[PDB]
Design a protein around this motif. Structure first.
Motif, mmCIF file in Angstrom:
data_model
loop_
_atom_site.group_PDB
_atom_site.id
_atom_site.type_symbol
_atom_site.label_atom_id
_atom_site.label_comp_id
_atom_site.label_asym_id
_atom_site.label_seq_id
_atom_site.Cartn_x
_atom_site.Cartn_y
_atom_site.Cartn_z
ATOM 1 N N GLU A 170 0.838 -1.220 0.000
ATOM 2 C CA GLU A 170 0.000 0.000 0.000
ATOM 3 C C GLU A 170 0.868 1.264 0.000
ATOM 4 N N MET A 171 1.940 1.240 0.787
ATOM 5 C CA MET A 171 2.907 2.370 0.868
ATOM 6 C C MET A 171 3.576 2.634 -0.478
ATOM 7 N N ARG A 172 3.992 1.546 -1.100
ATOM 8 C CA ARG A 172 4.652 1.586 -2.425
ATOM 9 C C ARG A 172 3.727 2.209 -3.469
ATOM 10 N N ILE A 173 2.469 1.795 -3.445
ATOM 11 C CA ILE A 173 1.443 2.335 -4.368
ATOM 12 C C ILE A 173 1.207 3.820 -4.062
ATOM 13 N N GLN A 174 1.038 4.120 -2.776
ATOM 14 C CA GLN A 174 0.779 5.510 -2.330
ATOM 15 C C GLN A 174 1.956 6.436 -2.697
ATOM 16 N N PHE A 175 3.173 5.954 -2.491
ATOM 17 C CA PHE A 175 4.367 6.749 -2.853
ATOM 18 C C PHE A 175 4.408 7.054 -4.348
ATOM 19 N N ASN A 176 4.147 6.041 -5.153
ATOM 20 C CA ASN A 176 4.162 6.204 -6.625
ATOM 21 C C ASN A 176 3.119 7.212 -7.101
ATOM 22 N N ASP A 177 1.915 7.109 -6.559
ATOM 23 C CA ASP A 177 0.816 8.056 -6.911
ATOM 24 C C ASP A 177 1.157 9.496 -6.510
ATOM 25 N N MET A 178 1.708 9.599 -5.314
ATOM 26 C CA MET A 178 2.102 10.888 -4.701
ATOM 27 C C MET A 178 3.229 11.542 -5.531
ATOM 28 N N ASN A 179 4.240 10.736 -5.843
ATOM 29 C CA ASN A 179 5.431 11.182 -6.613
ATOM 30 C C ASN A 179 5.044 11.604 -8.012
ATOM 31 N N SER A 180 4.197 10.788 -8.598
ATOM 32 C CA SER A 180 3.729 10.985 -9.979
ATOM 33 C C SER A 180 2.846 12.245 -10.108
ATOM 34 N N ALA A 181 1.927 12.391 -9.163
ATOM 35 C CA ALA A 181 1.001 13.566 -9.122
ATOM 36 C C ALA A 181 1.756 14.880 -8.903
ATOM 37 N N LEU A 182 2.786 14.823 -8.059
ATOM 38 C CA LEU A 182 3.586 16.022 -7.719
ATOM 39 C C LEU A 182 4.409 16.475 -8.930
ATOM 40 N N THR A 183 5.003 15.493 -9.590
ATOM 41 C CA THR A 183 5.795 15.717 -10.834
ATOM 42 C C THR A 183 4.948 16.334 -11.959
ATOM 43 N N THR A 184 3.721 15.859 -12.089
ATOM 44 C CA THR A 184 2.750 16.432 -13.069
ATOM 45 C C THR A 184 2.232 17.817 -12.659
ATOM 46 N N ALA A 185 1.975 17.974 -11.361
ATOM 47 C CA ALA A 185 1.345 19.214 -10.810
ATOM 48 C C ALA A 185 2.286 20.442 -10.835
ATOM 49 N N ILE A 186 3.565 20.196 -10.600
ATOM 50 C CA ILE A 186 4.516 21.295 -10.327
ATOM 51 C C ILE A 186 4.624 22.336 -11.455
ATOM 52 N N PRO A 187 4.739 21.910 -12.730
ATOM 53 C CA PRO A 187 4.840 22.908 -13.799
ATOM 54 C C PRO A 187 3.637 23.833 -13.870
ATOM 55 N N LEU A 188 2.516 23.372 -13.348
ATOM 56 C CA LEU A 188 1.281 24.196 -13.337
ATOM 57 C C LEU A 188 1.338 25.295 -12.269
ATOM 58 N N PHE A 189 2.329 25.178 -11.388
ATOM 59 C CA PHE A 189 2.658 26.238 -10.382
ATOM 60 C C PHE A 189 3.837 27.109 -10.842
ATOM 61 N N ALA A 190 4.195 26.923 -12.110
ATOM 62 C CA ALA A 190 5.277 27.688 -12.799
ATOM 63 C C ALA A 190 4.819 28.223 -14.177
ATOM 64 N N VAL A 191 3.532 28.553 -14.262
ATOM 65 C CA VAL A 191 2.911 29.052 -15.509
ATOM 66 C C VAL A 191 3.554 30.358 -15.958
ATOM 67 N N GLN A 192 3.918 30.382 -17.226
ATOM 68 C CA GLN A 192 4.550 31.558 -17.872
ATOM 69 C C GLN A 192 3.811 32.863 -17.569
ATOM 70 N N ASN A 193 4.595 33.862 -17.179
ATOM 71 C CA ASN A 193 4.106 35.226 -16.783
ATOM 72 C C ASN A 193 3.349 35.269 -15.455
ATOM 73 N N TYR A 194 3.260 34.124 -14.800
ATOM 74 C CA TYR A 194 2.599 34.046 -13.472
ATOM 75 C C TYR A 194 3.414 33.304 -12.415
ATOM 76 N N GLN A 195 4.714 33.250 -12.633
ATOM 77 C CA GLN A 195 5.624 32.545 -11.714
ATOM 78 C C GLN A 195 5.645 33.169 -10.320
ATOM 79 N N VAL A 196 5.581 34.498 -10.265
ATOM 80 C CA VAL A 196 5.671 35.228 -8.985
ATOM 81 C C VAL A 196 4.448 34.970 -8.093
ATOM 82 N N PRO A 197 3.226 35.194 -8.588
ATOM 83 C CA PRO A 197 2.086 35.001 -7.684
ATOM 84 C C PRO A 197 1.800 33.536 -7.292
ATOM 85 N N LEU A 198 2.425 32.640 -8.031
ATOM 86 C CA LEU A 198 2.307 31.180 -7.821
ATOM 87 C C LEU A 198 3.463 30.622 -7.000
ATOM 88 N N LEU A 199 4.358 31.508 -6.612
ATOM 89 C CA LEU A 199 5.629 31.109 -5.963
ATOM 90 C C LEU A 199 5.439 30.399 -4.623
#
Ligand code: NGA
Length: 578
Positions: free
Chosen positions: A99-128
């Motif tokens: 269960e931990m292994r599955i949870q870690f993979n989902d967590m790691n995978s979701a974070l890797t996908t999510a992060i660039p969306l917190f670095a959107v062009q021309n909006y890096q500062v308010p998303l910092l």
């Protein structure tokens, strides 16, 4: 509940400073403080906190996409946290391990996908801020698999690959955050006092919500810090009641205001402030003052700074003793503005303080020191408690470290008088003494030293949590070698310690580490950086003594630069109990 992202972050900082050790406590801590929310409220607030300051809303689509994604990470991390908690309670259980292994993979995978969306062009500062929060969580989760991944049932190849992710991303997230901190700050600069207020507010708020957190990222390297490690934040942040409570704006004053802040220095302890009073038309005010301070650990004589402002004689001088209990945690100032209908030397505009209450941090209670009277311009509004579950005098986050002054006009010959004390606040993690723990890896920043020869204190890049020590080259003078000495205290005299130094260098350099009179390291250490001017995360390396010793060697530690041609940056000393 009336809370802001600043409150929340300060609370997270407190946690990361005192609980930085792998295990369930850490994981549950992050849920409790940041990730345990339901719904978009918190995340919206985090964005507004920066948006309102730079006066720009994130494009609506990207904004909703980011908030929505943060909600997702929250749900997912809550599940991850509970799996971790149950698993720790029963570590051999195969079902929990899978269960931990599955949870870690989902967590790691979701974070890797999510992060660039917190670095959107021309909006890096308010998303910092949300970026940094996400980055923190990601590093955390990568740290978890590094420490526990084997026990969960991951293979050695997967663990090492995830650890390499960890070390790389410590660097990348750090550099990103600092870059956009710098960019955002610079954009907010302007020529007038209203501009300076906004500029300093940015510096302050993003120090507390971004920089402070980033400074602890290196701690996630589980191989470098296999047990509990305690960092110290020595950076200073600023309030200025006269300027910050002023509804108008002093034209062209910004540069002058900024210069009234003191330049990089070895950490000192504020002992007292002696305030001089001037008067105009029966209005008495703080016209000038004198600062007295001590070295770290009171390891030298008290020193006195040059006069700030003007020495007025309208009332007797008042010596305010700052160093009682935990020091001054709070100022409550009375601002005085006079804007007369007819103005002249006989009838002046005044922008001054006609009172300040200095309140003390204390485990019990201690009456406040009062210059003339208390007021309603409250430092606690800008410099809130790290722990809101106890009274502010116990749960405070900062300590008054200095008072300088922005000044304008002379009482004798001006129509307009400005006397605006600049209050400087050091994080409480910056202890009066350098105290080496027996059960954890103690970090002591080099700027907590008390003696610096052929070298200077320089501004930190923004990711070290304070300033840095630069040791100059000798010029091939064995008598002119750059030296920083740090006074230290050992409550345990039997514990053995290995001494590790965190440094930056452009060329290979011969360094000597002394503990008391004994040299415990003397060798060439490799170059770590291409430039000492534009410091990035990976520019800092580590070296350490081969052996471990006890406090019997002495109550000082130091580093000497043997190079005749090259300089070196010393970040901090680290004491590792064996
Ligand atoms: C021969 C030698 O290295 N002498 C050092 C000198 O270089 C300088 O560091 C000085 C600072 O106090 O200490 C001396 O003991």
């Amino acid at each position: 509940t009336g809370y802001t992202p600043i409150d929340i972050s300060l609370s997270l900082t407190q946690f990361l400073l005192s609980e930085f050790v792998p295990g369930a406590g850490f994981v549950l801590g992050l849920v409790d403080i940041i990730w345990g929310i339901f719904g978009p409220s918190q995340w919206d607030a985090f964005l507004v906190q920066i948006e309102q300051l730079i006066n720009q809303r994130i494009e609506e689509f990207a904004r909703n996409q980011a908030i929505s994604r943060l909600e997702g990470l929250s749900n997912l991390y809550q599940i991850y946290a509970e799996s971790f908690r149950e698993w720790e309670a029963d570590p051999t259980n195969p079902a929990l391990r899978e269960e931990m292994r599955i949870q870690f993979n989902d967590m790691n995978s979701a974070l890797t996908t999510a992060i660039p969306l917190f670095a959107v062009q021309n909006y890096q500062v308010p998303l910092l801020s949300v970026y940094v929060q996400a980055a923190n969580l990601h590093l955390s989760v990568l740290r978890d698999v590094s420490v526990f991944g084997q026990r969960w049932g991951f293979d050695a190849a997967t663990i090492n690959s995830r650890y390499n992710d960890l070390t790389r991303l410590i660097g990348n997230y750090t550099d990103y955050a600092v870059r956009w901190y710098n960019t955002g700050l610079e954009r907010v600069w302007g020529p007038d006092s209203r501009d300076w207020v906004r500029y300093n507010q940015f510096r302050r708020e993003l120090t507390l919500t971004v920089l402070d957190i980033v400074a602890l990222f290196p701690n996630y390297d589980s191989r470098r810090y296999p047990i509990r490690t305690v960092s110290q934040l020595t950076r200073e942040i600023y309030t200025n009641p006269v300027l910050e409570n002023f509804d108008g704006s002093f034209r062209g004053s910004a540069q002058g205001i900024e210069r009234s802040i003191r330049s990089p220095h070895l950490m000192d302890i504020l002992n007292s402030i002696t305030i001089y009073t001037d008067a105009h038309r029966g209005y008495y005010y703080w016209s000038g003052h004198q600062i007295m301070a001590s070295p770290v650990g009171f390891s030298g004589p008290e020193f006195t700074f040059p006069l700030y402002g003007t020495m007025g004689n309208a009332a007797p001088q008042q010596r305010i003793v700052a160093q009682l209990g935990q020091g001054v945690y709070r100022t409550l100032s009375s601002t005085l503005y006079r804007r007369p209908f007819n103005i002249g030397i006989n009838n002046q505009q005044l922008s001054v303080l006609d009172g300040t209450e200095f309140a003390y941090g204390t485990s019990s209670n201690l009456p406040s020191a009062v210059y003339r009277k208390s007021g309603t311009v409250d430092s606690l509004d800008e410099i809130p408690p790290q722990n809101n579950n106890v009274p502010p005098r116990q749960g405070f986050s900062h300590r008054l470290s200095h008072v300088s002054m922005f000044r304008s006009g002379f009482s004798n010959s001006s129509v307009s008088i400005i006397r605006a004390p600049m209050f400087s606040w050091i994080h409480r993690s910056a202890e009066f003494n350098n105290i080496i723990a027996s059960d954890s890896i103690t970090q002591i920043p080099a700027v907590k030293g008390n003696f610096l020869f052929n070298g200077s204190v320089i501004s930190g890049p923004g990711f070290t949590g304070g300033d840095l020590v630069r040791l100059n080259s000798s010029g091939n003078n064995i008598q002119n070698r750059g030296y920083i000495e740090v006074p230290i205290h050992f409550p345990s005299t039997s514990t053995r310690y290995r001494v590790r130094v965190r440094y930056a260098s452009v060329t290979p350099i011969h360094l000597n580490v002394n503990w008391g009179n004994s040299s415990i390291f003397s060798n060439t250490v490799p170059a770590t950086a291409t430039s000492l001017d534009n410091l990035q995360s990976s520019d800092f390396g580590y070296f350490e003594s081969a052996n471990a010793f006890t406090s019997s060697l002495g109550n000082i530690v130091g580093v000497r630069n043997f190079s005749g041609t090259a300089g070196v940056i010393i970040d901090r000393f680290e004491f590792i109990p064996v």
